Design a protein around this ligand. Structure first.
Ligand SMILES: *C(#N)N1[C][C][C][C](N2N=C(C3=[C][C]=C(OC4=[C][C]=C(F)[C]=C4F)[C]=[C]3)C(C([N])=O)=C2[N])[C]1
Length: 252
């Protein structure tokens, strides 16, 4: 639904992400909103605005909510839920936080709750990673940019299963594999997966079967969960419903 840009007030610069400039502001002084301004030529706009009608019908406490769009201008704006602590990759990298492993397992729980919701709606994320995850004033992790890789006009080699790398075979089981890499990202405190390798070198190793080592902060019970996401046989990989159950068991 077409938010009138007169309702919007811009107060803080939040920097740049996928498709460009992001800002913090208020809608009619009341609500805290994030405003993404779409850099021209970077997106398939008509296809996006069309999907945005169905993305607004989506709703989960751990999914960044879509307040609407401003597609009557040049450039077009996307209005969403305000996430004060920004990108999870930067939030994890800030060593001062002195995170407990229980805070890290709860980051996985959160994301997994958003992924179980998406999975049930048969909605694929296609680009699940800590860079597409946001953190709010309370330290909660919410899933963002769900399916935006479909409209983007540098590929996520480090989060891609072997069937995607050699054959481009996307499914629930591609998001499952990506989740496992994201669980590793969290426990490794924002470490770049397969950092010693280039995009092509990292892709070759994955196709052969090299898996991400156990991050020291992760217990064997934790590593078993993320390691079950990296099965060569996609059918052997659990669903987000199975993963969540396992996270909740380990929680205890
Ligand atoms: C990191 N570091 N970054 C880059 C700077 C901006 C920061 N930030 N971006 C947003 C944000 C993210 C996505 C938005 O638009 C969406 C969201 C979901 C979706 F499915 C489609 C879509 F277009 C809008 C704003 C926020 C924020 N929401 O607070 C922040 N902090 C992150």
């Amino acid at each position: 639904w077409e938010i009138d840009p007169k309702d919007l007030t811009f107060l803080k610069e939040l920097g740049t992400g996928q498709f460009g400039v992001v800002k913090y502001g208020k809608w009619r002084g009341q609500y805290d909103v994030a405003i993404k301004m779409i850099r021209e030529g970077s997106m398939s706009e008509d296809e996006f605005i069309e999907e945005a009608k169905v993305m607004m019908n989506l709703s989960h406490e751990k999914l960044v909510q879509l307040y609407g769009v401003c597609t009557k201008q040049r450039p077009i704006f996307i209005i969403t839920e305000y996430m004060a602590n920004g990108c999870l990759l930067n939030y994890l990298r800030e060593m001062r936080h002195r995170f407990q492993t229980q805070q890290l397992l709860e980051m996985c729980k959160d994301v997994c709750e958003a992924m179980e919701y998406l999975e049930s709606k048969q909605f694929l994320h296609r680009d699940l990673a800590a860079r597409n995850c946001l953190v709010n004033d309370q330290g909660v992790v919410k899933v963002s940019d769900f399916g935006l890789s479909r409209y983007v006009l540098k590929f996520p080699v480090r989060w891609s299963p072997p069937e995607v790398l050699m054959y481009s075979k996307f499914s629930s089981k591609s998001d499952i594999w990506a989740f496992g890499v994201l669980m590793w990202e969290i426990y490794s405190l924002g470490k770049m997966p397969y950092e010693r390798f280039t995009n092509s070198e990292a892709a070759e190793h994955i196709a052969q079967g090299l898996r991400l080592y156990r991050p020291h902060l992760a217990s064997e019970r934790v590593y078993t969960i993320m390691y079950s996401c990296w099965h060569e046989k996609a059918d052997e990989r659990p669903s987000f419903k199975i993963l969540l159950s396992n996270i909740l068991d380990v929680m205890d």
